[PDB]
Scaffold this active site. Sequence first.
Site, PDB file in Angstrom:
ATOM      1  N   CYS A   1      -0.271   0.537  -2.382  1.00 54.42           N
ATOM      2  CA  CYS A   1       0.462  -0.335  -2.120  1.00 54.42           C
ATOM      3  C   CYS A   1       0.688  -0.107  -0.410  1.00 54.42           C
ATOM      4  CB  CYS A   1       2.123  -0.338  -2.597  1.00 54.42           C
ATOM      5  SG  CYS A   1       2.012  -0.630  -4.563  1.00 54.42           S
TER       6      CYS A   1
ATOM      7  N   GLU B   1       9.905  -2.316  -6.161  1.00 53.73           N
ATOM      8  CA  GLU B   1       8.833  -1.989  -5.622  1.00 53.73           C
ATOM      9  C   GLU B   1       7.750  -2.697  -5.378  1.00 53.73           C
TER      10      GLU B   1
END
Lengths: 971, 52, 125, 63
Positions: free
Chosen positions: A774, A740
Amino acid sequence: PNIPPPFTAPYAPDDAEIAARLLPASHLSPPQEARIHRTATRLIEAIRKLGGVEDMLREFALSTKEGLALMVLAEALLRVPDARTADQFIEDKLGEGDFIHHETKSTAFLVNASAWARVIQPGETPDGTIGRLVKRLGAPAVRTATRQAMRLMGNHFVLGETIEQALERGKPGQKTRYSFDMLGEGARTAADARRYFDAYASAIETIGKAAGNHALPDRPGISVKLSALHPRFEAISRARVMVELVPQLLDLAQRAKAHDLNFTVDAEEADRLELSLDVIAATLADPSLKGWDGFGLAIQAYQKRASAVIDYVDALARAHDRKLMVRLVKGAYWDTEIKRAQERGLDGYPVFTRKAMTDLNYVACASKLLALRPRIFPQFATHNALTVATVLEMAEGSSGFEFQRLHGMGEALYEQLAKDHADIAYRTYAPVGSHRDLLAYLVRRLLENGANSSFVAQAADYRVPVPALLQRPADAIVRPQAAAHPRIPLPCDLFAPERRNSRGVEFGARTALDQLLTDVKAEIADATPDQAHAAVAAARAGFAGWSRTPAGIRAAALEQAAHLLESRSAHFIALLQREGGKTLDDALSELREAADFCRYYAAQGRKLFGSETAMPGPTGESNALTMRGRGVFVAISPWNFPLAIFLGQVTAALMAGNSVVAKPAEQTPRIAREAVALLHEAGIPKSALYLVTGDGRIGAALTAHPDIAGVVFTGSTEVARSINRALAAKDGPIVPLIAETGGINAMIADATALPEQVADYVVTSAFRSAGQRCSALRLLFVQEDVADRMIEMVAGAARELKIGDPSDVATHVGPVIDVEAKQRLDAHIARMKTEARLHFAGPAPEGCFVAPHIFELTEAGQLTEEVFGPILHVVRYRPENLERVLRAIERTGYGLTLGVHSRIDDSIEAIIDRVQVGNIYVNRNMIGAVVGVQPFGGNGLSGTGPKAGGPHYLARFATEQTVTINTAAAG
Amino acid sequence: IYVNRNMIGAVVGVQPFGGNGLSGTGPKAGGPHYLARFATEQTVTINTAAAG
Amino acid sequence: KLFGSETAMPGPTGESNALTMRGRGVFVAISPWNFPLAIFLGQVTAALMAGNSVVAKPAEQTPRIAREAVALLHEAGIPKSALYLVTGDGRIGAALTAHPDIAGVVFTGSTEVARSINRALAAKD
Amino acid sequence: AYRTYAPVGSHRDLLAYLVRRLLENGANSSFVAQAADYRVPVPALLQRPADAIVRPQAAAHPR
Ligand SMILES: Cc1cc2nc3c(=O)[nH]c(=O)nc-3n(C[C@H](O)[C@H](O)[C@H](O)COP(=O)(O)OP(=O)(O)OC[C@H]3O[C@@H](n4cnc5c(N)ncnc54)[C@H](O)[C@@H]3O)c2cc1C
Ligand SMILES: Cc1cc2nc3c(=O)[nH]c(=O)nc-3n(C[C@H](O)[C@H](O)[C@H](O)COP(=O)(O)OP(=O)(O)OC[C@H]3O[C@@H](n4cnc5c(N)ncnc54)[C@H](O)[C@@H]3O)c2cc1C
């Protein structure tokens, strides 16, 4: 008597216990009920004998969205200088095409008058709210509905581009027949707070000059909202609110007192109750308000605390020796309160969940208020015929109180009431204000007129017999245990029976926040490469036993880890604040997420690994599919969610039957070590889970080890590739990599979006956690017609964010993680300053801080990197160039989160179809993915998949095995 | 694993076929975890509160 | 079952949450000589089914069956623009797998070649 | 061209006529009734009969 203590009633007590008292006390003698029944029948008969909003919604079978669009189009059309020009538009253009253009322009007109002032090609695909309306009803009916909206907007609203224009339009040398329900709410900027103040001040003068000669209560009133008067009206900013807002509320109360007007503080969300009562009390206490009986406030009966708010207001009035005018309402934010309590994982609802309970509590409250006469002058605001008849009966007279209604509702009700009872007083409020404040007001208004439980809606539906409208609330409830709504679960049961929900805290309940603040205040050598290798070997040894431990037993360990996390929330929150730099809400949220990861992967674990899947096949043969651990997983985690992503990755690997070597980020090993010790204590064997700390070198030692069976990684795109290269370089098995990585996350806002809402969502998404998420907004695309107002509002909102020590409750933006981060951010800022327009550069305190910055770019291509901090980039665009915007988003190669803000379903859907982004957020912020609700993770340069917190995650950590047995010898 | 029969001729949807370690990455062809690997997930979250 | 409809996720009132599965992009399908029809079609139709377009390179020894299969898929409803056959050696296979625009590889064959494919993928930026 | 008929006659013949008239204006399958109900989208009013039947064996009403 004594000034009462700060208001602090229990936030969400049990409905049944409340019902146990309210049900018997609501009893009425047969002659009392007979009078109620007759009065109410007469009122409803008059109602069913003009036009209102509900009538328009019913007549065209309009959704609230369609109602909204037509009323907005109507207001724009009413402000065209020459009526014949509007007439031409309606007949010739409207409904023929340009559906989205008309919807976009008329909405833009509300903030940018210049925007609204073309030739339509035939056979245009009918899209947009209006085009969809036209496909459904036909163009002629849409024109007719727009003209009806025009009569409603022109007759029931007092509007203008500025408050001066509204005020001039609503003028009567006589008295106004209406009090003013001012449009403003929720200042987003310091300048908004001043504008609303001046509007209120101006309104009071206009109202004053035309107030007639009678004494109160027969003088006009004005309604005021605390959120309009302060840009951070919230519990955590209480210190600055008491110092800033009180003098402003005092100044307006004084201006009102000088005309001897009724001055009413409206009631807003449940999380603002206590704070508003603090503001109201300190304001009322000022000696300058003596000798005036017009000060007052609204109290919401749909709240469990309503009866205690009444006691508090009464004691306040006795303590300062004042007479107060008190408005009793049911409440306008019901949906909002349910949703918030669920999101915040509260232990209950501050409001009732059965309509009949609100109705019950309203009558009980009216009864209480009537007995506080003559010190309190009650104002019963309702358009419910039964509620009116019942309050009238309980009063036993007509003096010392009034009813209230809004212009455009309850007209037939109160006319008839006045005929049948000549001494009855009722106050009528008109909505008054500027176009830029209309959208927010219309939305709230339309939810109640469109509600099916709404009295107004039902009375206007002739299917509903009059006797149905007259059912007594006590007979709808019947039994105390039936008080709560059976189809609305408490927040802790939101996911039942799949799993329990983690608990949150209501910051707007001072008892809860104070205790949380108190509990929290009350609360590592690197590894050598050899120690890292020994860790892998030790984990390789523990694998055999852990993979063969039954899935139910592995799940039990996760669920016990969840339980211990929530039990020790204060310890972990303290760590998140001190080692992570997180504000109290971010830390609490992270704690919830960590526990949610455990319970969710536990639940998915039992479903996935709990039993084999029988495959169909021939007779005399069995075929069974199973999923087994892979081996040793290496879990590598980032500094920004140092507890939840740490545990999410680790417990997933463990749940699938793998042993784990976990290396946390260099900046946050202490929380990782506490997490690992907690898992061990929860049932994870020492031999299945190892913690190794150190730099990228240590991380690279683990991932280069020949014996590992997979890597789960969250962090920079650049490091993921090097990890991927180190794995592919080995001659061993190709092991899975779950990575990720970052994003350059965009948001698209069109001119149908509410600028104040978008501003809220932009500020949150870009600047919460100092932009160290993020999923954070990096790139805002906004339509040119609303660009200046949107940008100015985001900038003004960002300037109200308190930056500082995360442990201080008033802080909105804490420090960035380390000096290296601050240096990278300050360098991007210096560059952007020479490259792009600076709309905002906030003042940062000394230390490891970077303040929110807003830059406007000429084009998206000027933003080429993910910048991991509180820095927003804005591109304005032309509506026909959406294709260029979408390409600009496609070009970065990233695909984590995307925001879309628009009223237009066809535009939203066209954007969803086009992009490949992992998480799309529509008309809300882009952050705070909830485990099992928003499976989170991106593609392209943003990640490999599968999505964490979703149903495809666990399988990737496991391997399949098929066992095929020839069973024919058994028979 | 094949017990008391031959080791060949995996039937689609009956014996999801494919190995691990040096034998393969997964997922198993002809089994129920295969298709997902060829696709990507997308979550759409819509605030519907304005509709009621 | 998988791509036919979205999965509604549990969540708060006033909010909808739906999970869907989309094609990734261009898949490169590389197939061996030993099951030149079935493994060819297994890999190819799986990628297509998931919503990807496909460039398929069959084993050097068996292109004739691969071409008949691809022609059959077109005829059964796969648009010409979604499925392409490229024939040749390992070098041609290496051209497809080194291409910066592809979204995945499905490969059946030798362990040694899988590693080299895996290395060529990780090498890309 | 279209011809418009008016009901013409005596009061003693009205009741029988009204009853028949009211059954069709009150019918839910009635086109006139549906067109006057704004809940019913225009495209619904335009469904072709052949697409409502689909198959010969479905011709009779199942209930
Ligand atoms: C002049 C005026 C000023 C007002 N000022 C305010 C204010 O400052 N703050 C504020 O919050 N409200 C205020 N209101 C109230 C709000 O705007 C609505 O008008 C009011 O709640 C409708 O109540 P009712 O008796 O007219 O209608 P009804 O149809 O009888 O009652 C509807 C109400 O029931 C409640 N309700 C609906 N469903 C449920 C349920 N499942 N469980 C529990 N309760 C339910 C809601 O409160 C809803 O508004 C004001 C109203 C007026 C007329
Ligand atoms: C000027 C005029 C003169 C007329 N004269 C006569 C006459 O002499 N004799 C006579 O019988 N009618 C006569 N009619 C027809 C009758 O009065 C109705 O007006 C007509 O049937 C309605 O058809 P439609 O195309 O208007 O409406 P629609 O709403 O399209 O059609 C409704 C019709 O569908 C039919 N129907 C309803 N449900 C079903 C079902 N479940 N299965 C099968 N069929 C169904 C019925 O016939 C019903 O009337 C006359 C109509 C007009 C306008």
